[PDB]
Design a protein around this nucleic acid. Structure first.
Ligand SMILES: [Mg+2]
Ligand SMILES: [Zn+2]
Ligand SMILES: [Zn+2]
Lengths: 67, 263, 133, 62, 147, 32, 39, 49, 506, 113, 137
RNA sequence: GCUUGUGCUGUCUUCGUCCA
């Protein structure tokens, strides 16, 4: 739904690296190189950013219920 | 008799080698650093308004996981051990968040930098959310579109990672000993040859490989331990190590006092 | 004190299935027709073919809960390189002078073939085996 | 007739300090308060409660 | 995704789980006895391929009837500094000593099923009964009895 | 320019101190 | 629509990745099939 | 769905036949009474109009 | 529906889970279920103080009570009583106290095929919401922990409690009258770990031996002398296992005509409760007759036999926790030297089948009496293909090392068999539908990818590959057909068997 | 629903003693110690420290159940030494070891800062 | 398009590689030596298209015992995920939404058209196969 | 002295869960 704050397995904070990851991918870097540049060594952390699906961008497209 | 040798040092991780200690002492130190060093984390969320697409308890869970600076948490008291009615400034830190999107187009991101410390213990360096730099926006908390507002008041308390994983100062403690398997503590699965099918340890160059004609030594014990301590930023690596040692000492001293008072 | 004493030359050493256990077969130098089949721990007392071993069997180490030995006390085991303790589970009073004694040191098996005169005293419940090299 | 029944209350001592709840059972000296934070109901002595009123929080004199 | 259903037996904290040399603790431990009788080799192959993919930042292609072989995945895994078959030297959480047996270790896709214990636990001492037969009613939702 | 435009002999100088068909590059929109 | 910045970046990444996959996977398959043929 | 019901059941209707190749899923079927009687179209199948 | 069997009160139902740290005849009961269910205890002068304490605690605090029943039969509800502390209990009243520890309760799983499906356990109140069982009792119940649920029934009288504790108790049900052999034995990783722990080359240091000895509840506080005294004190796994066996047990078994010197460490010899030689596995601590469990039950009685399960499980589980055991993809792989042998065997079998096809097509085939030419041909081809799969599997099995984990699990008998190794490593084999090869569903062929009138092994459902190697689409479809047949056969025969058993019982 | 509170792992009830000692009469000079709200962290440390003392002939511990936070330790010394004195010596020795370890780490960190 | 009755009269090739005439890991193709020559009339687009919607989620279904494939087809319809993106505005009798869905690391090509990448129903857990304490038997 | 609030259908049908 939205990038988790902590890696499930170990507990490293990965919630502050989603925007940087998208910026790096925008510049043409490969996914492995982008994850390496963010200093994500353990594959337990790498799966958190690699396999995250961002669904909040789909929930936000609905008109807000209040105003 | 015990010795410490530091390999790499940083604000967030230290890589060190312990020697002349028992394996049990090193493992107890690792366990204490993982789950018994007190830190500060958000423990109550009072939601005054939440019109975002995320559930209230979703955002509460996300907030609880945000690391807060816990340098002076020793001076702070536990919530259950404070005689004050309700919460005072000496057992809790109050943070407040207020986010809103203006205009009828675009999306606003709510970051942990928006958490503003309102009240806390006097002159104690605790409560502020951890920031990598002065320009680091921090952990992404939520997203908002037009006419969606988030207005909450959070209270941070002192606790340990035994109660909940959000109070853990460390992320992952790499721990390793005997790279060349001279003690034969593990038996290596193989298909053809066990020597060339197994990758070398990252500390294999720190110890002399066994000689081809060497016999097994049954009198040897694990003596040198290589461990890396990574933190979430709430506490520095040296602070985590020192406070783990101090916590272990306090536990043993409590046991000793109980024994001496038992008679 | 000691119930049996001899010197054996190792004929065969069989590792086989295991890594830490070897079967050794030996015949007494002073007297043929005495055989010794034995399990040993390779990592603690490694042996090679054609080695000479001094084997002694005793019913006690003196000169119920086990305790780590104090450095101050002295026992019969101070003179040997490999001491085991086991139970005798078979004493085959076989043919005219063919006697077999089966001893199990916690699963590590030993069989001792010999004449009646040599192995008469080995009719005990438990035996220590003391090996020197 | 147990005037504090079905009233919002706050806990000031013990292991649940500062948690908002609602009083459910008021037999005597042992109040059953359901917690808003987890989905559970716990017993609690009367001395440990702060009953909400029209002017802030009031101790057990409501 | 291979018919390997199960329920949680106990939960251990971070410091009680076995860990590898680089500090990785598993999220989930399953018994080896689930594999040989049921012959779900695809479970092991998926674990290996997922390990390689997460290390290299790719997504594995597990389409059936392709030319993928286990040896290619093993070569890729070996080139990255891991044991080619997926084993890992793992330490004991309680005492810190090495485990004598290496542990198969890697990420696998798990899914949470709708059947939770708190939706199935039910007890009854006394309660409503049927009007016709005066026996306990049927159903957990109606505080019924067991047959 | 890129690695392809490099001379083959100079490409041979790039030695690690080939793609495989079963490692896709991740996507987000898929297709259909 | 006025799509957000993150969505636009994701769309660009998806287009690039689709093109790169369509090239590299096809090249690898062509490399493998000829080797399997000559064996 | 195959409306053969439960009364007068037989194994032959429930079996996976050779001619099912490519038109129905060989793996997906319910458990218990409706095993084999309930079928799922393959991923490229169609029905004539 | 209302007279032979009816819905009942005082019962509970929830998911079951496993607990290695429970005695054989103990069940773990959640706190909420313990609070909901109750047992009416008569107030006497041996328990009036305790029962008054329970009444004071009320229906929300454990231990507590729900009702107080007077002599005349009136019920006093403790939820709606404002003066619970102002209640004095008279002799002869009943207090419907909460379920407590060591209360006998009947425990049941459906379908109840035999009388060991209902046994009485002793209650132990535990947190979380699942029933907990010692894993040795999962065999008589035919239960595992993938989602099964079991029923609990509470006796409501002294007479009924005595009947449950003296007739249906778990220790009394270890030996079954159906085949005069035990129904409960060491299972799963305890079996695997008692095989690994009792190998000839397993040695244990002093500090681990002390921990392992303290774990045995029945240990007498005397540490056995180590097998090796010098240079380093070492104990063998057989010693630590013999610690768990009660004294005075004699067991002798000959496996493959082994001598008393047991070169292969097979067979068995237990003298006065001490293991002399032999690896302990399914043939010793399993559910078969004449094993250790049967001997202990006949010799010492149900109580000691029940304690034996706990002792063995605790020791072996500690050792296996601190040793480890796993399985990986590398355990299903055979080297090239064995793969070429398997390929050669399969090719030879296919050539033989081709020769048989030629002989049958040229009328040169001998006819088995009582069978037609087609039937004899089909039988011969099926026999040849089955022999091919068996030969390839035997080659693969002989390849495997001792450190192979699948081989260890098969050797211990804990899980798997030779056919599983053969299919995972060597060859899946011939797929049979209704006892015959894959029929000609299409017009004179099995799939539209084969030519008409093709009797080759691969054209009628012979999966040449292994699960590790992967199945081609045709083999995949044929294997799916066979699996569907298996599922249908199970789901159909279950109802017929149920009807037969009901008629027999009536 | 039936999940216990997490603070019960380390918060000691008032009526529950932290440390209960009962003699073991089956063998001479042996005691059984029951630690409440403790786990392998303290137990393994104490056990491996005591195992090296020449006057301690048996030391072991076990955690009966992972769902309950307590462990029980068996200690048995020589005739001269009372077991409780050995336990106190072990605690003090580990405290000194930790103290010197902390001092050395601080020195090294200051050097490499 | 061909139906079940026209398939009786056609000769299909499994892969385009079948249209033309010593490794221990790769699988073995049928020899098909009974026919001196073949005249194929059609070719399968891709053999993995014989699977349904639920069976297209299994990775490497050809390395599995078939009853396990059937059991997974059954259990994949009970996995909690994100059934729709408008779950906030819907009033269903029940609804289960997973906090942090993740797409599988080992996927299949048929998952592209099932939108499994956009509405996944699981998470990638670090799994270790071991007899640790006896609580996973 | 103002005194606290006790009760739930039924019949079909379908879809599931655990064994078989
Ligand atoms: Mg089951
Ligand atoms: Zn991580
Ligand atoms: Zn305070």
């Amino acid at each position: 739904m939205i990038i988790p704050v902590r890696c499930f397995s170990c507990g490293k904070v990965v919630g502050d690296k989603w925007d940087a990851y998208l910026r790096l991918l925008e510049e043409g870097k490969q996914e492995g190189d982008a994850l390496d540049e963010l200093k994500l060594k353990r594959y337990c952390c790498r799966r958190m950013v690699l396999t995250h699906v961002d669904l909040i961008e789909k929930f936000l497209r609905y008109n807000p219920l209040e105003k | 008799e015990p010795k410490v040798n530091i390999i790499n040092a940083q604000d967030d991780e230290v890589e060190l080698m312990l020697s002349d200690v028992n394996l049990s002492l090193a493992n107890s130190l690792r366990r204490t650093m993982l789950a018994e060093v007190p830190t500060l984390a958000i423990d109550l969320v009072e939601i005054k308004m939440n019109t975002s697409v995320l559930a209230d308890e979703f955002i509460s869970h996300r907030l609880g996981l945000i690391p807060l600076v816990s340098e002076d948490v020793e001076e702070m008291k536990y919530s259950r051990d404070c005689t004050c009615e309700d919460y005072c400034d000496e057992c809790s830190v109050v943070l407040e968040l207020s986010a809103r999107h203006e205009g009828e187009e675009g999306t606003t991101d709510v970051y942990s930098s928006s958490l503003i410390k309102v009240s806390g213990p006097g002159n104690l360096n605790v409560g502020e959310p951890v920031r990598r730099d002065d320009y680091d926006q921090g952990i992404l908390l939520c997203k908002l579109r037009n006419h969606q507002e988030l207005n909450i008041r959070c209270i941070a308390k002192k606790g340990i990672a035994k109660e909940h994983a959000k109070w853990s100062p460390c992320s992952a403690i790499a721990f390793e000993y005997d790279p060349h398997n001279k003690l034969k503590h593990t038996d290596f699965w193989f298909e053809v040859d066990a020597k060339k099918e197994w990758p070398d340890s990252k500390y294999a160059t720190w110890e002399e490989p066994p000689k081809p004609g060497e016999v097994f030594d049954y009198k040897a014990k694990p003596n040198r331990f290589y461990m890396t301590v990574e933190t979430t930023g709430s506490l520095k690596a040296n602070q985590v190590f020192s406070r783990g040692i101090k916590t272990l000492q306090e536990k043993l001293a409590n046991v000793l006092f109980e024994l001496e008072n038992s008679r | 004190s000691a119930l049996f004493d001899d010197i054996f030359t190792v004929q065969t050493v069989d590792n086989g299935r295991y890594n830490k256990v070897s079967r050794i077969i030996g015949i007494s130098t002073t007297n043929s027709a005495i055989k010794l089949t034995l399990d040993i721990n390779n990592e603690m007392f490694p042996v090679s073919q054609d080695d000479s071993l001094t084997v002694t069997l005793a019913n006690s180490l003196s000169l119920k809960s086990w305790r780590p030995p104090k450095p101050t006390d002295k026992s019969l085991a101070d003179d040997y390189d490999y001491v085991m303790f086991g139970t005798v589970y078979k004493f085959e009073e076989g043919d005219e002078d063919k006697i077999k004694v089966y001893v199990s040191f916690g699963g590590l098996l030993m069989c001792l073939e010999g004449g009646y005169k040599s192995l008469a005293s080995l009719k005990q419940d438990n035996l220590y085996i003391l090996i020197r090299r | 007739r147990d005037p504090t029944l079905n009233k919002t209350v706050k806990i000031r001592q013990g292991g649940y300090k500062g948690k908002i709840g609602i009083v459910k059972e008021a037999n005597g000296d042992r109040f059953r308060v359901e917690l808003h934070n987890p989905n559970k109901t716990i017993p609690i002595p009367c001395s440990f409660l702060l009953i909400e009123s029209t002017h802030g929080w009031v101790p057990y004199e409501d | 995704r291979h018919g390997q259903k199960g329920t949680i037996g106990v939960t251990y904290r971070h410091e009680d789980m076995p860990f590898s040399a680089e500090g990785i603790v598993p999220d989930l431990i399953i018994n080896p006895h689930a594999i040989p009788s049921r012959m779900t080799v695809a479970h092991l192959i998926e674990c290996l391929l997922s390990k390689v993919g997460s290390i290299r930042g790719y997504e594995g292609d597990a389409t059936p009837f392709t030319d993928l072989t286990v040896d290619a995945v093993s070569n890729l895994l070996r080139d990255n500094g891991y044991q080619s078959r997926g084993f890992e030297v793992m330490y004991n959480g309680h005492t810190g000593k090495k485990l004598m047996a290496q542990v198969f270790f890697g990420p696998t896709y798990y899914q949470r099923l709708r059947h939770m214990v708190d939706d199935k636990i039910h007890a009854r001492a006394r309660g409503p009964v049927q009007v016709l037969t005066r026996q306990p009613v049927e159903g957990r939702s109606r505080d019924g009895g067991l047959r | 320019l890129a690695i392809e435009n490099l001379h083959p002999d100079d490409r041979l100088l790039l030695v690690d101190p080939s793609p495989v068909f079963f490692l896709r590059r991740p996507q987000y929109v898929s297709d259909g | 629509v006025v799509a957000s910045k993150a969505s636009s970046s994701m769309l660009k990444i998806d287009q690039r990745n689709k093109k790169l996959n369509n090239r590299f996977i096809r090249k690898a398959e062509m490399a493998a099939v000829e080797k399997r043929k000559l064996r | 769905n195959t409306p053969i019901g439960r009364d007068g059941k037989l194994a032959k209707p429930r079996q996976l036949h050779n001619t099912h190749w490519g038109l129905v899923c060989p793996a997906e079927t319910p458990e218990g009474q409706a095993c084999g009687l309930v079928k799922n179209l393959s991923l490229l199948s169609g029905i004539s109009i | 529906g209302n007279l032979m069997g009816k819905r009942v009160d005082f019962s509970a139902r929830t998911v079951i889970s496993g607990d290695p740290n429970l005695e054989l005849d103990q069940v773990g009961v959640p706190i909420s279920i313990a609070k909901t269910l109750s047992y009416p205890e008569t107030v006497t002068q041996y328990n009036i103080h305790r029962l008054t304490e329970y009444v004071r605690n009320g229906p929300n605090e454990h231990p507590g009570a729900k009702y107080v029943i007077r002599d005349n039969g009136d019920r006093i509800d403790l939820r709606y009583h404002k003066r619970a502390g102002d209640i004095v209990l008279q002799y002869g009243w009943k207090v419907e106290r909460h379920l407590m520890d060591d209360d006998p309760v009947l425990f049941n799983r459906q379908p109840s095929l035999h009388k060991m499906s209902m046994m009485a356990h002793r209650v132990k109140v535990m947190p979380y919401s699942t029933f907990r069982l010692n894993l040795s009792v999962t065999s008589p119940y035919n239960a595992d922990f993938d989602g099964d649920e079991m029923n609990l029934h509470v006796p409501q009288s002294e007479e009924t409690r005595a009947e449950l504790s003296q007739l249906c108790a778990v220790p009394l049900q270890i030996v079954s009258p159906q085949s005069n052999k035990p129904v409960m034995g060491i299972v799963q990783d305890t079996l695997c770990g008692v095989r690994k722990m009792t190998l000839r080359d397993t040695f244990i240091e002093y500090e681990q031996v002390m921990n392992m000895l303290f774990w045995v509840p029945s240990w007498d506080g005397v540490v056995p002398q180590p097998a090796i005294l010098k240079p380093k004190p070492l104990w063998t796994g057989k010693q630590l296992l013999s610690i768990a066996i009660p004294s005075g047990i004699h067991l002798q078994r000959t496996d493959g005509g082994n001598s008393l010197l047991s070169p292969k460490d097979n067979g068995m010899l237990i003298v006065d409760g001490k293991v002399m030689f032999g690896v302990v596995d399914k043939k010793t601590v399993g559910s078969g007759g004449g094993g250790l469990i049967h001997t202990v039950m006949r010799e010492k009685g149900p109580k000691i036999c029940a304690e034996l399960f706990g002792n063995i499980q605790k020791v072996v589980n500690y050792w296996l926790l601190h040793n480890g055991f796993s399985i990986g993809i590398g355990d299903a792989i055979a080297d090239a030297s064995t793969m070429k042998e398997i390929t050669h065997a399969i090719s030879s079998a296919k050539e033989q089948v081709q020769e048989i096809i030629y002989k049958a097509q040229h009328n040169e085939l001998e006819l088995k009496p009582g069978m037609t030419l087609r039937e004899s041909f089909e039988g011969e081809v099926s026999r040849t293909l089955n022999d091919a799969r068996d030969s390839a599997g035997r080659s693969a099995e002989m390849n495997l090392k001792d450190l192979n984990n699948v081989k260890q699990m098969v050797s211990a008998g804990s899980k798997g068999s030779f056919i599983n190794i053969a299919q995972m490593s060597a060859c899946v084999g011939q797929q049979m539908v209704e006892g015959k090869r894959i029929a000609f569903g299409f017009a004179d062929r099995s799939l539209p990818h084969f030519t008409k009138d093709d009797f080759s092994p691969e054209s009628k459902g012979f999966v040449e590959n292994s699960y590790l190697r992967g199945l081609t689409p045709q083999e995949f479809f044929f294997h799916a057909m066979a699996g569907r047949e298996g599922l249908i056969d199970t789901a159909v025969k279950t109802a017929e068997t149920g009807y037969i058993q009901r008629r027999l019982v009536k | 629903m039936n999940a216990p509170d997490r603070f019960e792992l380390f918060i000691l009830p008032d009526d529950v003693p932290k440390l209960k000692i009962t003699p073991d009469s089956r063998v001479p000079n042996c005691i059984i110690i029951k630690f409440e709200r403790e786990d392998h962290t303290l137990a393994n440390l104490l056990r491996e420290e005591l195992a090296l003392y020449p006057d301690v002939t048996f030391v072991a511990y076990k955690v009966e159940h992972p769902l309950f936070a307590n462990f029980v330790m068996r200690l048995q010394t020589e005739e001269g030494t009372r077991p409780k004195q050995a336990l106190e010596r072990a605690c003090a020795s580990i405290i000194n070891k930790l103290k010197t370890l902390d001092h050395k780490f601080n020195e090294e960190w200051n050097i490499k800062n | 398009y061909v139906d079940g009755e026209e398939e009786e009269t056609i000769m299909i090739a499994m892969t385009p590689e079948d249209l033309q005439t010593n490794d221990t890991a790769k699988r073995i193709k049928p020899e098909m030596s009974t026919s001196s020559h073949h005249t194929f009339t059609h070719c399968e687009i891709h053999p993995s298209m014989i699977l349904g919607v639920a069976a297209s989620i299994i990775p490497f279904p050809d390395h599995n015992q078939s009853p396990r494939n059937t059991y997974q087809s059954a259990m994949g319809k009970q996995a909690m995920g994100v059934f729709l993106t408008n779950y906030n505005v819907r009033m269903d009798t029940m609804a289960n939404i997973l906090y942090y869905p993740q797409k599988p690391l080992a996927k299949t090509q048929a998952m592209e058209y099932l939108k499994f990448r956009e509405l996944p129903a699981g998470q990638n857990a670090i799994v270790a196969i071991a007899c640790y304490s006896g609580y996973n038997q």
